[PDB]
């Protein structure tokens, strides 16, 4: 589909039977979801942005469905004020910016 | 143009005869630029992101050329780690997300 930007581009994503709302963010290299338990090993990581850095947990090969699209990749979990879908996954669903 | 997301969507913008590199960011409501001087009166403002809140300076009605397309709107200036073009200006140049 074609998503306009009059409002925040929030969409529905499916993770392990969990359905959540996420922000399509071209300004994020990675995907950062709010606190949630995921199976598997994870490496500690520090990610930054406006304001500074926060510590998150990195999980790999996590299956995620975005608007009926299947995607699998790295997912960072930490105290994020909002769920963020980054470029690592956006490229997988063929998402582009157009004007 | 159509922009893919395998790399950061950085583009060149022209603001006040100055050329700068900025990130097309659908995950930002506003446009925030690194410290620089702009004409006109500005009001102090606080904005937030991943690592918390920061203080910025708000300039209104500033003309900004993004890859040749003209926009005129609010530009916030402050300690952002990277220049970002937010939705306030992206909507003005007709930018959409597609997949």
């Amino acid at each position: 589909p074609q998503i306009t930007l009059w409002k925040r581009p929030l969409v529905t994503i499916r993770i392990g039977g969990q359905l959540k709302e996420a922000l399509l963010n071209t300004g994020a290299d990675d995907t950062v979801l709010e606190e949630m338990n995921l199976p598997g090993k994870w490496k500690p990581k520090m990610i930054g942005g406006i304001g500074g850095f926060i510590k998150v947990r990195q999980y790999d090969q996590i299956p995620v469905e975005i608007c009926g699209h299947k995607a699998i990749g790295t997912v960072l979990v930490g105290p994020t004020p909002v769920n963020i879908i980054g470029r690592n996954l956006l490229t997988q669903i063929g998402c582009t910016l157009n004007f | 143009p159509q922009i893919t997301l395998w790399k950061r969507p950085l583009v060149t913008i022209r603001i006040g005869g100055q050329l700068k590199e900025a990130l097309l960011n659908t995950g930002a409501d506003d446009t925030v630029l690194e410290e620089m001087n702009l004409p006109g009166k500005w009001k102090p403002k606080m904005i937030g992101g991943i690592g918390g809140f920061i203080k910025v300076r708000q300039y209104d009605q500033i003309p900004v050329e993004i890859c040749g397309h003209k926009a005129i709107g609010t530009v916030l200036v402050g300690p952002t780690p990277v220049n970002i073009i937010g939705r306030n200006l992206l909507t003005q140049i007709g930018c959409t997300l597609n997949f």
């Binding site: 300004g27 994020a28 942005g49 406006i50 | 995950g27 930002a28 937030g48």
Partner: peptide
């Protein structure tokens, strides 16, 4: 890796 999410 930088996440540039920004809220007004």
């Amino acid at each position: 890796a930088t996440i540039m999410m920004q809220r007004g």
